[PDB]
Structure formats: structure tokens, C-alpha cells
Amino acid sequence: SLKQTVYIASPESQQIHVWNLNHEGALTLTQVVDVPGQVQPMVVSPDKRYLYVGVRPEFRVLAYRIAPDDGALTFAAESALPGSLTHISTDHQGQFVFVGSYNAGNVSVTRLEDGLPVGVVDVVEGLDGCHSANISPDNRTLWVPALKQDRICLFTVSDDGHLVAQDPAEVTTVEGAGPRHMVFHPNEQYAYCVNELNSSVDVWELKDPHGNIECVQTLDMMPENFSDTRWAADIHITPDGRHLYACDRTASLITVFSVSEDGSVLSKEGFQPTETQPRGFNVDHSGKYLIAAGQKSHHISVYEIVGEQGLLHEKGRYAVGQGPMWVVVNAHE
């Protein structure tokens, strides 16, 4: 039967909370990890053997072995990075770990040898405010949002992990939009990017009728009457590709979007008040539950995704560490 583990990063208290998620959406605390640093971004390896996380003030990628039974974590390795690890991810084969650094303004590739990080293979500078690195469905193109430059850079990922700027070298957003995080639709035809500075979501078609990457839709994710400081953060889509969510740190809301059948058109369904100042959240592998953290509430809330509209229904509230801001869910048989 399906078993899932929810991981929460709380940098301020340097902790990682490990929860078991049952079919009713209830969580039970499995473990509290004391990380030797302020842990922020996290990602599970494709083979699910490891959890890679980034820490500061000593910039490093930390690899934790994931117990296949209860998902418990144990330190396995560490590898130094040139700058702050704002975002972290891997390619589909689990051969490389990609790291976007906001402060250093770059993206780097770290070689993974049998799941463990052994150093930086390549780095691309000049990407002011790089906020994430996301490999495409075919595992060949890395989409790298540069928040300060209002663009998403595109690089071909060679076999030995080197990044080669494609042409076009990138796609552009609205002036002052601030592209931050993004995800791809399960059908591999579209990508959705959340823009931090103007709290909007862009729908990107990977290859339109003319063979180009085009932004085919742009929506304001905020309530129509909202007119405060826009501070968008995270974005996620359910496994079935029917529901897409995004959060804003100022309004402390999760915007619910419904997705058209082909995935090209988004529709704003409603908003869910959530944990104070939500920087990170995620959905489970069944597409039935949504877990959101409050950077200023030091708690996470679990919601059930209901019906076609996919609106959220609060089920529980749990205490975590200080300043939680990242959530990931690992599923195992």
C-alpha cells in the first residue's frame, strides 16, 4: 500500500521535520533532524535513496540517506558550493545536482557518483538573482529563472554535465515580474512559472505550432481587490495535471488554479488563507493533500484537495521548526 513521507525545512532552528502521511491526510512525527546549518532547499533523488539539501552560512549540498521503510534521514555526504543554495534539483537520471544561487547570481552543476555529491562540474555566472534550475521533461534543457533579469535562461545539459547556452539563450517576462519558481505539466507540453515581484503566473508552451517556446498566457494570481506588496513564492501542480497552486507571502494565501485538459489554459478558482507568510508548500503524490508552511507561523497546515475546482479544505495543523520554508513529499511502496 502507498506510504508517503513529508519533509519540512526549518532553517532558523536548523531542523528538518520528517512526517508520515496516511490516506486520511493525518501526519505523525517520525523524526526531527538537527542539521549542521540553516537548511533551505531540498529535493529527493530520482531513485529515492537520498535527500539533497542546501545549507548556510557554510554553503554546501548535504546528502542524507533515506530509509526505505519510514523515510528516516542519516547524514551521508557533503559537498561545497560557491554560493548560497537558493534552489536545488537533479536531472532525471540522478547523475547531477543543479543549484541556483540568488546572491552569487549563477547556476552550477555538481556531479553525483552513486548518489553522492563529489564536486562542481560547471558553473554559469551573470545570471543575476538566479532563483531555480529546472531540467526539462526530456532531460536535455535546463530552465533557469533569473529573477533580477526578468528572464528564464535555457541551457543544453551535455552528457558530462556542462551547460551550453541554447538559442534563443532565454525567454523574457514582464518588466519587473521576477521569475522565481516553475514546474512542468505531466504531459510535458507546458511549463508554469510564478513571478515573485508582481505575483503572476506565466504559461509557457515548450514548442508551439512554429517550433518556439512561447508564453501563451499570463494571470494575476492575487484576488482582484488585492493591492499590497506582491511577494509570490512557490508553485506546484498535482500529478494528474488538473490543479495548479501558487502562494504569496504578503497575503498569506494559496491561489487555486484549474488547468484545461490540454494544459494550455489556467483558470483562477479561488484563494485559501494559510500559514502566515507561506514561502514553501507542496502536494502529495496522490494529488489529494496540500501541505503548506508558514515562515512566520512556524507551523504547517494540511489541506485536502476537493472536487473539480480543487479548492482546499483544512484537515490539520502541526508545529515544526522556526521559519519553515520548504516542503517535499516522497512516496514509497
The set of residues, in sequence order, having a beta carbon less than 8 Å from that of 57 and lying 6+ positions away, is: 37, 38
**What's the burial of 126, exposed, middle or buried (CB within 10 Å: 0-12/13-18/19+)?**
exposed
**What's the burial of 254, exposed, middle or buried (CB within 10 Å: 0-12/13-18/19+)?**
buried
DSSP string, 153-204: EEEEE-TTS-EEEEEEEEEE-STT--EEEEEE-TTSSEEEEEETTTTEEEEE
* CATH number of the domain residue 86 falls in: 2.130.10.10
Of 258, 247, 191, the C-alpha closest to 222 is 247
Domain range for 300: 1-333
What 3-state class would DSSP assign to 39? coil
Whether residue 22 contacts residue 306, with contact meaning beta carbons closer than 8 Å, is answered with no
Q: In whole angstroms, what is the distance from residue 176 CA to residue 53 CA? A: 29
Cell numbers representing residue 197 in the block: 515581484
Q: How many domains does the chain have?
A: 1
Cell numbers representing residue 147 in the block: 529573477
